[PDB]
């Protein structure tokens, strides 16, 4: 199965994806619900591009990456 690695403040989560047309928004929502519970605002960053939020409406395919950092908006990775 395909999955992405999400690095967060207190550990990592592997998030299953059906395909690379999934949006980055869907991945973030799954990561936040698992690691934080029911709902602070969060962003995802490409592993190799720190301090820049990925466009959550874009597809996983458009990111050309399989590892992301989950960061609270007022914080850094």
């Amino acid at each position: 199965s395909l999955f992405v690695r999400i690095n967060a403040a207190h550990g990592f989560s592997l998030i299953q994806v059906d395909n690379t047309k999934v949006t980055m928004k869907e991945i973030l929502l799954k990561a936040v619900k698992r690691r934080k519970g029911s709902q602070p605002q969060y962003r995802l960053e490409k592993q190799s591009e720190p301090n820049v939020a990925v466009d959550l409406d874009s597809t996983l395919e458009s990111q050309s990456a399989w590892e992301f950092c989950l960061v609270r908006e007022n914080s850094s990775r």
Partner: protein, 167 residues
């Protein structure tokens, strides 16, 4: 500014590995069954008066991800081997987890606890002395837990840290 302990939760699919982990970390019971690939959670706790960092690895019960076991078994410092008291197949499955951990550790003793989870449920198909005797054959404690009611959840994880500290 404190010691970290790397704990690993293993066992068949659906026994409650994730529910146990999230009850410990977040004081919350997960009702949904979202199968795990792999997730880690770090939390500062006080155990026997000593502050430390727990690094808990929540692993896959689904056989599709069985290749991952080699990696995490080598560096894990203590293992919760979890079955569900209403699922004798998950009790059978404990042996394959214990045997793979043993092989990767070259047959050393490893901090480990046999955990019988879902003890809140009325249906019980694993017998108590049966579970105690499996634990005794491995030389490890047996602890009955419920991720739903939090029964003995801290006991199970904290026993690993007590053992890692002594070994």
């Amino acid at each position: 500014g404190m010691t970290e302990y790397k704990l690993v939760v293993v066992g068949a699919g659906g026994v409650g590995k994730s529910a146990l982990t999230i009850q410990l970390i977040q004081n919350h019971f997960v009702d949904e069954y979202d199968p795990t690939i792999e997730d880690s959670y770090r939390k500062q706790v006080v155990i026997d008066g000593e502050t430390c960092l727990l690094d808990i690895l929540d692993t896959a019960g689904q056989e599709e991800y069985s290749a991952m076991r080699d990696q995490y078994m080598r560096t894990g410092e203590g293992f919760l081997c979890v079955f569900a008291i209403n699922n004798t197949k998950s009790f059978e499955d404990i042996h394959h987890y214990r045997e793979q951990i043993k092989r990767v550790k070259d047959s050393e003793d490893v901090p480990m606890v046999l955990v019988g989870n879902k003890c809140d449920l009325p249906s019980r198909t694993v017998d108590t002395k049966q579970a105690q005797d499996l634990a005794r054959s491995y030389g490890i404690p047996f602890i009955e837990t419920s991720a739903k009611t939090r029964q003995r959840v801290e006991d199970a994880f904290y026993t690993l840290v007590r053992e890692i500290r002594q070994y």
